[PDB]
Amino acid sequence: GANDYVPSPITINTSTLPVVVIGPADAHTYPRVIGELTGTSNQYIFNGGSLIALMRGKFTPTLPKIGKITYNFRQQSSDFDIFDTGVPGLGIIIGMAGYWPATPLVPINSSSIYIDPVAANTNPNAYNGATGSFGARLYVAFVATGRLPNGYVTIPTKQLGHILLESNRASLNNKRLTAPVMLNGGRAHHHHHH
Ligand SMILES: [Co+2]
Ligand SMILES: [Co+2]
């Protein structure tokens, strides 16, 4: 049916964090970015309806934010909210972008933001060109916010936030379809030396 779009999560994997080695120069200095996860993408965060639509995606982070940190993703520098994972000593920062490669990375540093098209953040009438899917790219870096144990650190799967689907077709907009933005759990490997 015309509006039978269905949500699909976008996920990024703890297991891709490189081994974290902290030497005497950066030991006990907080906060500090300790590594980036492999960036991911999902073309079909919303997909399925038979009638094409002009769509946009609004992201809302849902973890507690405890501070800010300046960072430039390897995948200018910007401020990012540091979100508390619930694991002592570990925070995360988030960036997101449109699925299409030319769209810019959007730092997560506010209560909610349109990740694509970014024009919608200053124009409430701005949507993506009409098509059958809405997708995104996801970027995450881990932050040492405090002492971490040596060895393997278990990181449970966490929901980072959700994307709300909006459209200039009211019947689709009124569904308030939402898709989870997920950090798949894993183990970080951490070595700390003085
Ligand atoms: Co120490
Ligand atoms: Co080791």
Side-chain angles (χ1 to χ4, degrees):
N3 288 332
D4 284 302
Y5 291 85
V6 291
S8 172
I10 179 163
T11 307
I12 193 161
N13 297 312
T14 293
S15 54
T16 60
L17 186 76
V19 174
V20 174
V21 282
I22 310 304
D26 304 325
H28 314 123
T29 293
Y30 309 111
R32 59 171 180 278
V33 176
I34 53 179
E36 294 178 13
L37 305 182
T38 302
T40 57
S41 63
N42 186 349
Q43 186 167 4
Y44 311 104
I45 300 181
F46 305 97
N47 178 80
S50 60
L51 190 66
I52 57 167
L54 293 87
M55 296 173 280
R56 64 190 182 201
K58 191 180 72 175
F59 173 76
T60 295
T62 48
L63 295 172
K65 52 180 174 62
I66 60 157
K68 283 179 196 294
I69 191 167
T70 304
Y71 188 64
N72 193 337
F73 262 95
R74 297 179 180 178
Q75 284 163 119
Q76 290 290 71
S77 299
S78 308
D79 275 10
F80 291 79
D81 279 325
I82 300 173
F83 296 107
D84 187 0
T85 61
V87 182
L90 182 70
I92 53 167
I93 56 176
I94 305 173
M96 301 200 76
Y99 182 72
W100 321 113
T103 58
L105 187 155
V106 181
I108 299 310
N109 54 28
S110 64
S111 58
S112 74
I113 198 85
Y114 289 102
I115 59 168
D116 190 45
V118 293
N121 289 306
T122 51
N123 176 5
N125 292 320
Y127 299 86
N128 278 347
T131 188
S133 300
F134 177 89
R137 288 174 292 170
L138 173 59
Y139 304 92
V140 168
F142 282 15
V143 180
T145 61
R147 174 269 187 184
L148 292 168
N150 282 318
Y152 292 94
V153 187
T154 292
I155 304 158
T157 293
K158 304 293 309 187
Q159 183 154 349
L160 306 179
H162 56 267
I163 302 171
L164 171 74
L165 174 66
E166 292 187 335
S167 179
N168 74 320
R169 181 154 79 242
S171 59
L172 181 55
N173 197 72
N174 287 342
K175 292 187 181 304
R176 297 185 66 75
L177 296 174
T178 76
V181 178
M182 299 297 296
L183 173 71
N184 188 29
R187 296 190 305 168
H189 194 54
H190 169 245
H191 290 285
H192 173 73
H193 300 94
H194 306 164

